[model samples]
Target chain A: ILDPEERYEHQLRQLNDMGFFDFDRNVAALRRSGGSVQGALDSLLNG
Target chain B: SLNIHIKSGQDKWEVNVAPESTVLQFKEAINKANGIPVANQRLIYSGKILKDDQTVESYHIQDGHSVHLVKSQ
Candidate 1:
């Protein structure tokens, strides 16, 4: 099941913080929220 | 062998890859061409930063996929 739009930035942040950013994935959280792109980079650098 | 070529700010690199490799893995192979590892290497795919483990098999990369490589600080 998938919604046209939902929220998953929080989860995406968690995965990215764990170094998943460099691991590679089409993040459900990121793809869902549409913030996965910028959020990952922002958090990767800032967090 | 996964054949690929790339150009970055006057730097050119190449690599051979196997089938079933993901796009991210393919990029990783290319990254290694420059003596760099896929992990810990910052890269942007289609203007979006990418993770190292993102697979090309899942994404389905055709021949001559032009991926822009960036240096991660």
Candidate 2:
């Protein structure tokens, strides 16, 4: 499987534009779920 | 810096937060200050529900804005 970095940058840019802080936290969340933006979102979305 | 007015029940607390603050962090701050459970808080700001993962900037929450907190069922 290709690394998720390529798509990661794209998602990161999108999230950045969306005004999300803590880029590293989101990247870790993305990596945890294997590149799904929703997964990354959950990391911060849920209490 | 941002000034947040949180209304919960009959209590209102004015909190100062950094621009980079997230909704989750804000909730935590409220919890610490007001003894409310973060999980039970539903923050409504600017006519929309504020999600935990979202930053204050995402909702364009500015200084002196009001954020209402309702208890979750």
Candidate 3:
């Protein structure tokens, strides 16, 4: 899993573009998924 | 980099990704391009389900080819 310090900038923007506006939540999800945007989206979707 | 087409149902996304990128990374790219969640996403090429750890080039997925994306319900 990608560490929280290795958060993905591009993916954060990608999620924002998809209409998820919570910045903290986005970062948390990216880290939770280990930098996988799809996994991040899943995390966000479940919230 | 190759311009691969991702077809999901009636939707389509033209995404450019490196040949060296793994299937998981490719799904992440598709997630961004088409707003499809990676966990629910599946890629099919040559009627075979692409595995996550394998690179696109490992599957010999050439440029301009289309990979079908099926979302699990």
Candidate 4:
């Protein structure tokens, strides 16, 4: 099990590793949307 | 067949892949053609990140267009 912080880092790292830009915005969206990796990515991609 | 150029570190390669293939599949092709692993790859095109679940067609990647690749920071 991972804490929220850890989970957020894990997801962030994965996304950044995948070349997603605008780090803070993406993270905020991830947290705001309950941390769905796909959703966060889609938001970033579309915007 | 589509012509896709991949740039990694100091090396660059032009490879052909099916447009119907996913970005993940293209990554796999790069892995096979070069020696980089998919896990260590990050593909960028036109300032947008390419998702594994999305197809090359979705990105509208054209012939002679370049995809920049880098390792995780």
Candidate 5:
């Protein structure tokens, strides 16, 4: 299991770089998606 | 159709669900309602954690029942 809490800051920055700047939502998705950038992308897109 | 009440401290969300729906799916629906992530969701019903493998029916969830959603510290 990926620890989103551990990678939270960096992952969050990555999301911002990718243009997904909604901070809290990004955190929510990253925290729950194995801390994978792709998973969080899907979560943002599937919206 | 089920209308589940989700309480996350000062935030509250309502969503539709099916008795046959997995707790995982229920969490996704919650994610839709409030941007909560699946792994971050700690759903407590009847004072116990809901498992991803189980059905809402398996948890004996009823209408008007409140499910507590605890996030990570």
Candidate 6:
């Protein structure tokens, strides 16, 4: 079975160009899956 | 066992289906409830991409499981 890469690459490129490089942080937030995105934003802001 | 729910502006919807139903089928149910086209609707399950034709039961979607549906840009 072919692994579905889907449009992840294309989407990544578009997101990057659009200043959506927050994927790394977003993915990190998702992995934590406990705190709100706004909470993370607060930490970044306060730190 | 699962009961699918759809959320409109202020309304909620529920559709019961067998475990054999696929992700696409669930998307279809959303269409049935809100009359919204699936052209760009994105379905994210537990913060993951939903595979087409994947069995819902095998995915361990328990009763009252909440899946997030976001509108595409």
Instruction: Please give the TM-score of chain B in predicted model 3.
Output: 0.94
Q: Per-residue CA lDDT of candidate 5, range A4-44, in tens?
A: 44558777765664456787788888777968765676677
TM-score of 4: 0.59
Per-candidate TM-score against the hidden true structure: 0.44, 0.58, 0.59, 0.59, 0.59, 0.52
Please say which candidate is ahead in DockQ: 1 or 4: 4
Candidate 4 vs candidate 6, DockQ winner: 4
Error of 2 at B27 (Å): 0.5
RMSD of each: 10.6, 11.3, 13.9, 8.9, 12.8, 14.0
In TM-score terms, candidate 2 sits at 0.58
Q: So what's the TM-score on candidate 1?
A: 0.44
Where does candidate 5 stray beyond 4 Å? A1-47
Q: How close is candidate 5 at the interface, in terms of C-alpha RMSD after superposing the true interface residues?
A: 14.3
* Residue-level lDDT tens digits of model 6 in A1-47: 32212424443333233233566654443334333433333232233
User: What C-alpha root-mean-square deviation, in Å, does candidate 2 show against the real structure?
Assistant: 11.3
Question: What C-alpha lDDT, on a 0 to 100 scale, does residue B55 get in candidate 6?
Answer: 78
Model 1 stretches with alpha carbons more than 4 Å out: A1-47, B22-24
Tens-digit lDDT string for candidate 1 (B1-73): 4455554444667667775776567766776668666654555434345455665544343456544454553
Question: How does residue A30 of candidate 1 score in lDDT?
Answer: 55
Writing each residue's lDDT as its tens digit, candidate 4 over B1-73 gives 7888887545788778899899899999989988888987878786577889898978888888878776553
lDDT of 5 by residue, B1-73 (tens): 7888887646778889998999999999999879878888867675346888899989888887778676653
Q: Where does candidate 3 chain A have its weakest 10-residue lDDT segment?
A: A1-10
Look at candidate 5 and tell me the lDDT of residue B18.
Answer: 92
Name the candidate that leads on DockQ: 4
TM-score of chain B of each: 0.59, 0.90, 0.94, 0.91, 0.93, 0.72
lDDT of 4 by residue, A1-47 (tens): 46555778867765664466567786787986688765675577666
